[PDB]
Write a protein that binds this ligand. Structure first.
Ligand SMILES: CCCCCCCCCCCC
Ligand SMILES: CCCCCCCCCCCC
Ligand SMILES: CCCCCCCCCCCC
Length: 625
């Protein structure tokens, strides 16, 4: 009977005070792991040079920087050694946030066809989102926890007990039942938050007192309350009425859509924002910045999955406020997705938000397709924001548009649905499903371009206090050896030989996966040492000036998996001009991939090869040659 979509018996933040600290690897282990990852990428001569640099680093400056890093960590046990430096890196970056960083996740349709009406779904998705906001702020959202055995740890029985254990010892309680609570310090930024462009480093802004929603349609800005001053969610039928009002607006797109500015270089946008304020738009900008989130209503249907990906990843530049913590998008055909700003968090908060909202809006919708909009004066409740644009601002919007169109025109995206099998078949073959997907990417790249390249796979270290992410390096001596066998020398190898090579890839990949989740990767450690060197005003150590290091950090193959019943498709642009941005998901009986590329690479051809490699892998696993 309330506005909460969850009623946790355990306070949302119950485990935060007792989360284990993010460990720092021993310098000896990091150097060894760094070298292991370089083995498949460097030729003998390059490797020798790099190995020598590592030896020197470990005994010289590296040893010194590591000591300082440990000393610093001890003085800040309330956080992690990597969180601050990581935020600093992204807030300082001056590149456009569109494509370079902002990703998207698209919702599956409501199982009930009729409920996918734009007005209906925009209303239900919006109401569920505010219900999430209320639930989170009330501490009634179930604590984020990773269960190894849900049937024993994620039960009311355990909940009734841990609930009495003090926050200072709660983590241990879950630990005993093989449950791992996660960090939730970023979750508050899901709402009333935005990224503000500033001269050298951007700032993350949040106004927890704001109660209005920002809606974008045909480039126009609208705001209206979704939470009243009493703290209750505005009547769903009234919200429906205001959205119907917005959807009825016949005003044409503005000649100069202001939203384009959020896609600019950060220094350029920072200055243009200053002028916007100098020209009297501060009040308007404050309304935009503080809205609970941004709801975008596109006036067109999705033509194909490719069109959907483009629409949710970047759109046409006029109807998305890229700086907002997130943009909830709902197209004419009801297709919905969440486009979010990268810098404020690691996206776990967004996924949780995403799953809860999908569940709540499809299982307990606020309104139905037959619901009657409540009587109300929408023209009074809904304010159309206006921007006083000077000649310099219009020129600025024009330039932003040309820069946007120029970049977007080079982006290509496509997907595949491998339906011969998934987790079930692979697990029976006693192989890691994730390791197999990664092996396929390596094999496809070798077949398409004839080389082994720097590969990145995202992993979470959210099991630790202020944990963030760590890098899993799937390109190994094993995947290289295996790919060469499948691609170069087929036949010359027996099916048995191919099977054991894949087993070797899977085993090593599992090792790297566990180490990464435990903060035992080498990337964050090496980055933190470099960040500290720079902070100390010290010269960049030769280890980092090594071409091998730069190459290890030019991730041609960027990947991240996403597993969720609420997610239909997801994606992100490549992180380097000649790279691929690979979002994939291994399901029980099939495998899906959504791949992006710029002019330099061919996503469509790559996927063809990925399909081919997955078929070859499945054949070999079935005893076929
Ligand atoms: C101990 C490992 C916990 C991992 C928790 C799930 C992380 C999912 C990240 C999703 C990012 C979109
Ligand atoms: C949201 C999907 C992210 C996939 C992984 C991208 C990793 C890029 C790291 C770049 C470091 C310089
Ligand atoms: C059936 C709905 C569309 C599925 C398209 C294939 C999967 C694309 C990759 C998803 C990665 C999260």
């Amino acid at each position: 009977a309330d506005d909460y979509l969850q009623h946790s018996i355990v306070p949302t933040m119950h485990y935060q005070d007792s989360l284990p600290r993010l460990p720092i690897p021993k310098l000896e282990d990091t150097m060894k792991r760094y070298l292991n990852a370089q083995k498949p990428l460097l030729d003998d001569s390059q490797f020798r040079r790099t190995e020598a640099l590592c030896k020197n680093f470990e005994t010289g400056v590296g040893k010194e920087l590591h000591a300082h890093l440990l000393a610093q960590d001890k003085q800040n046990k309330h956080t992690s050694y990597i969180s601050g430096p990581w935020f600093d890196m992204y807030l300082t970056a001056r590149d456009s946030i569109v494509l370079n960083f902002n990703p998207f996740m698209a919702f599956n349709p409501d199982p009930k066809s009729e409920y996918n009406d734009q007005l209906t779904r925009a209303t239900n998705l919006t109401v569920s989102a505010v219900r999430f906001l209320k639930t989170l702020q009330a501490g009634l959202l179930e604590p984020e926890v990773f269960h190894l055995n849900p049937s024993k740890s994620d039960t009311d029985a355990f909940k009734r007990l841990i609930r009495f254990v003090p926050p200072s010892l709660s983590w241990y309680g879950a630990y005993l039942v093989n449950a791992y609570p996660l960090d939730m310090s970023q979750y508050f930024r899901l709402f009333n938050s935005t990224r503000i462009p500033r001269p050298n480093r951007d700032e993350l802004f949040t106004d927890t007192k704001a109660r209005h929603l920002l809606v974008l349609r045909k480039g126009h800005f609208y705001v209206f309350d979704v939470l009243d001053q009493d703290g209750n969610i505005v009547n769903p039928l009234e919200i429906q009425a205001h959205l119907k009002y917005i959807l009825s607006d016949s005003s044409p797109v503005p000649e100069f859509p202001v939203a384009y500015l959020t896609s600019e270089n950060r220094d350029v946008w920072a200055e243009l924002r200053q002028k916007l304020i100098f020209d009297g738009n501060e009040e308007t900008l404050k309304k935009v910045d503080s809205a609970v989130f941004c709801l975008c209503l596109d006036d067109f249907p999705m033509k194909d999955l490719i069109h959907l990906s483009h629409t949710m990843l970047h759109g046409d530049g006029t109807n998305r406020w890229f700086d907002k913590s997130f943009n909830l998008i709902v197209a004419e055909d009801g297709t919905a997705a969440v486009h979010f700003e990268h810098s404020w968090g690691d996206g776990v908060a967004v996924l949780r938000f995403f799953n809860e909202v999908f569940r709540d809006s499809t299982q307990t919708p606020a309104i139905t397709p037959q619901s009657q909009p409540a009587a109300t004066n929408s023209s009074a409740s809904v304010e159309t924001l206006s921007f006083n644009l000077s000649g310099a601002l219009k020129a600025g919007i024009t330039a932003a548009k040309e820069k946007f169109d120029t970049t977007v025109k080079t982006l290509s995206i496509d997907s595949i649905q491998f339906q011969r099998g998934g987790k079930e078949f692979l697990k029976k073959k006693q192989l890691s499903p994730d390791a197999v997907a990664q092996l396929a990417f390596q094999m496809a790249f070798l077949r398409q371009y004839g080389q082994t390249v720097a590969t990145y796979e995202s992993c979470s270290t959210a099991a630790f206090k202020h944990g963030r992410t760590e890098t899993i390096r799937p390109a190994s001596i094993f995947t290289k050896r295996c790919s060469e066998a499948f691609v170069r020398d087929p036949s010359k190898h027996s099916v048995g030989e191919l099977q054991h090579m894949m087993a070797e890839c899977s085993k090593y990949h599992g090792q790297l996966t566990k180490e990464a989740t435990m903060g035992q990767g080498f990337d964050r450690h090496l980055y933190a040492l470099r960040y500290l060197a720079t902070a100390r005003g010290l010269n960049l150590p030769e280890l980092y000036l090594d071409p091998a290091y730069q190459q290890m950090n030019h991730n041609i193959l960027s990947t991240s998996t996403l597993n969720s019943p609420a997610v239909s498709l997801g994606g992100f642009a490549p992180v380097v001009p000649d790279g691929f941005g690979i979002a994939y998901a291994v399901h029980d009986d099939w495998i899906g991939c959504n791949v992006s590329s710029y002019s330099g690479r061919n996503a469509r051809e790559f996927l063809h090869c990925v399909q081919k490699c997955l078929e070859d892998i499945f054949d070999a696993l079935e005893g076929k040659a």
